[PDB]
Amino acid sequence: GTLFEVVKLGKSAMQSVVDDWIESYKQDRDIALLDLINFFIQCSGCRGTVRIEMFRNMQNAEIIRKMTEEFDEDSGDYPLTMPGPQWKKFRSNFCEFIGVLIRQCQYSIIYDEYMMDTVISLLTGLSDSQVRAFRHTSTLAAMKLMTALVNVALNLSIHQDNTQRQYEAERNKANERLELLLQKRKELQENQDEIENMMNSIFKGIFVHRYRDAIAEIRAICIEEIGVWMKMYSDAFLNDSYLKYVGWTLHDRQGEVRLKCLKALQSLYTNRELFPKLELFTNRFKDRIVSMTLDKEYDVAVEAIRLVTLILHGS
Numbered sequence: 100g101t102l103f104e105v106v107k108l109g110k111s112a113m114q115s116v117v118d119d120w121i122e123s124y125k126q127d128r129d130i131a132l133l134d135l136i137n138f139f140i141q142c143s144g145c146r147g148t149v150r151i152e153m154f155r156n157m158q159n160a161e162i163i164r165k166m167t168e169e170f171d172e173d174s175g176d177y178p179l180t181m182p183g184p185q186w187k188k189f190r191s192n193f194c195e196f197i198g199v200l201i202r203q204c205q206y207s208i209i210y211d212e213y214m215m216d217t218v219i220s221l222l223t224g225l226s227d228s229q230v231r232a233f234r235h236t237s238t239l240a241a242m243k244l245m246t247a248l249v250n251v252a253l254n255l256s257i258h259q260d261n262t263q264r265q266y267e268a269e270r271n272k273a274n275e276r277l278e279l280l281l282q283k284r285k286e287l288q289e290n291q292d293e294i295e296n297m298m299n300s301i302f303k304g305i306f307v308h309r310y311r312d313a314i315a316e317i318r319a320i321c322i323e324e325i326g327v328w329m330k331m332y333s334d335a336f337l338n339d340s341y342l343k344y345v346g347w348t349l350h351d352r353q354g355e356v357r358l359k360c361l362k363a364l365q366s367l368y369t370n371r372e373l374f375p376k377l378e379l380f381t382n383r384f385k386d387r388i389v390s391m392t393l394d395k396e397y398d399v400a401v402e403a404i405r406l407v408t409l410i411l412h413g414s
């Protein structure tokens with residue numbers, strides 16, 4: 100509305116486009132998911148357009164194969180790898196968009212059994228594309244999606260704590276206000292459970308394949324982001340099964356990737372509370388970690404020395 104109401108509210112570029120999308124979704128889901136699908140397709144640098152009757156008749160496999168056919172056979176150069184000056188902040192807007200979208204959907208739409216299954220399906224299928232641009236765009240998106248879901252789970256944890264307190268204050272006094280709180284307690288656990296299944300799909304469907312991708316930037320993206328999930332939500336993500344992937348990737352040929360493992364590991368070891376869950380990992384990868392303090396790459400070696408310094412200050 101008025102200059103004042105707009106300024107007072109102060110909506111980001113990405114929040115404005117998300118809120119319009121969400122309203123579009125509420126009028127027609129199919130058209131809105133179609134526009135979201137064509138978003139991931141166009142962000143990959145694909146010239147093609149998924150039509151609504153393709154959306155309603157075809158599987159992802161065929162949609163993707165059909166959209167695969169509409170690339171520039173000549174150029175392998177796409178928005179996540181174009182230098183600029185436009186494409187400067189595209190990558191930043193592309194990442195913020197995903198976060199905002201899920202943040203804004205996180206109380207209803209996210210749970211409607213259609214929006215997230217449509218997205219994770221497409222992103223999973225694009226992530227197995229032979230086309231470098233599809234793998235890279237989808238995989239980045241999927242990683243950022245995962246992070247956004249982990250925040251959904253963190254907010255749910257605060258709401259569970261609030262409701263637990265409210266139930267206990269009301270118990271210590273069985274009217275309508277109790278069973279409602281017992282019912283909100285149950286609904287929030289069910290919400291956590293559904294978020295977990297989406298996280299499991301993205302992890303089993305995309306992360307565990309892309310982390311060892313041929314492209315070094317894809318490897319980097321996975322490793323950086325699993326670092327984030329482990330710091331943010333240790334109970335679910337910081338375990339020997341997942342640390343294995345951070346461990347195995349210390350040996351990466353490319354400096355950028357190794358750098359990312361080390362920074363991933365710094366953010367865990369820095370945390371006095373997480374150290375007991377790192378003991379076995381330190382033992383299995385001590386040699387490889389410690390080797391990297393004189394890594395041929397100067398910027399890696401620096402980060403390994405910081406790591407080892409953190410590891411030491413722990414015990």
Ligand SMILES: O=S1(=O)CCN(Cc2ccco2)CC1
Pocket residue numbers: 249252253254256331332333334335
């Ligand atoms: O894993 S933690 O270190 C950080 C998160 N908290 C609560 C939480 C957030 C999401 C689900 O549960 C548990 C301890």
